[PDB]
């Protein structure tokens, strides 16, 4: 039976010039990913669709979200989404994570205007 | 083995201020799902991706999807997709749904211009 | 155990006023798809979620993907992703199938500015 995540924002944080999310699990069923925060950390290795929306807000000229995983220190894009006021971008892909990685979900702009609600951004897992 | 259910366009219905389409199966394996006219029942509990593809035609200042669930009479937003002629708009999840529950895809404007093509708007469920 | 690929960009390929891309595995477990070149052959019968984005470059008025299938020459558009400098396009579905099936990703406009860039463009299976 299929180990699943679903996460929900909690607050939007913040020098860096990025932005991400803390995100707040809503549905989980197994163990092998654990949110802490902005980040997810996998500790179980396998092969995991990945799924992240993200609504904006902002009037600015380009955004999109940047789904990476970083191993040994040495970071890796999985996946993006870009789009040129309320506008939701989606992307999704299968890939291998192994124990240890840390998936993140930034915005390469300082402090972008997003929803928070949980129908709108959202970042999700299932193991395959 | 995976119990899916791939749903395209038959018409698209409206004093109510929103828009529905009325969805019809081309591919069904398992069967806790039942599309009935614009909604989908749920019959078999459980984790559940779900997908929405709508292809919008408006000039309107704003559109998007709305996919609800209704279980005891109190609606919960699942997940939303927005954008900004020809334009589609793509959002996907996984939901834990209990047997019972109703499943919506609506459009918060009155008589909106729709795609029928089964390639353009289409909703989907795979249980996991 | 879940049969998965997932392919990205080598090359941008175009008198056919269409546009492809030349498709190169970087995850693959099982084995009943095999890309080559421009198309996925489909080897094992099945119904597998398919999942496309292509990340366009053009100013044209309008642009997308194009998923398609053929089977004894008689094609079929699976689903397709729309959008009127930068912006990607995602969409995904389930789909039936057969062994002899070839898979293709077009774009209908010739000569096709896309991003070759992994994160950017990819098709993607898994076997349900
Ligand atoms: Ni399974």
Same mark, same amino acid.
């Given at each position: 039976?299929?180990?699943?995540?679903?996460?929900?924002?909690?607050?939007?944080?913040?020098?860096? +010039? /990025? #932005?991400?999310? %803390?995100? @707040?699990? !809503?549905? $989980?069923? *197994?163990? &092998?990913?654990?949110?802490?925060?902005?980040?997810?950390?996998?500790?179980?290795?396998?092969?995991?669709?990945?799924?992240?929306?993200?609504?904006?807000? +902002? /009037? #600015?000229?380009? %955004?999109? @979200?940047? !789904?990476? $995983?970083? *191993?040994? &220190?040495?970071?890796?894009?999985?996946?993006?989404?870009?789009?040129?006021?309320?506008?939701?971008?989606?992307?999704?892909?299968?890939?291998?994570?192994?124990?240890?990685?840390?998936?993140?979900?930034?915005?390469?702009?300082?402090?972008?205007?997003?929803?928070?609600?949980?129908?709108?951004?959202?970042?999700?897992?299932?193991?395959?």
């Amino acid at each position: 039976k299929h180990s699943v995540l679903h996460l929900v924002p909690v607050n939007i944080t913040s020098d860096s +010039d /990025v #932005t991400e999310v %803390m995100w @707040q699990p !809503v549905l $989980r069923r *197994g163990r &092998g990913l654990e949110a802490q925060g902005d980040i997810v950390r996998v500790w179980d290795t396998g092969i995991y669709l990945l799924y992240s929306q993200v609504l904006f807000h +902002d /009037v #600015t000229f380009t %955004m999109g @979200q940047v !789904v990476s $995983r970083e *191993g040994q &220190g040495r970071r890796e894009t999985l996946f993006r989404c870009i789009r040129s006021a309320y506008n939701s971008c989606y992307s999704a892909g299968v890939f291998h994570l192994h124990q240890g990685d840390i998936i993140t979900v930034k915005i390469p702009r300082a402090n972008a205007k997003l929803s928070l609600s949980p129908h709108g951004t959202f970042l999700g897992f299932v193991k395959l």
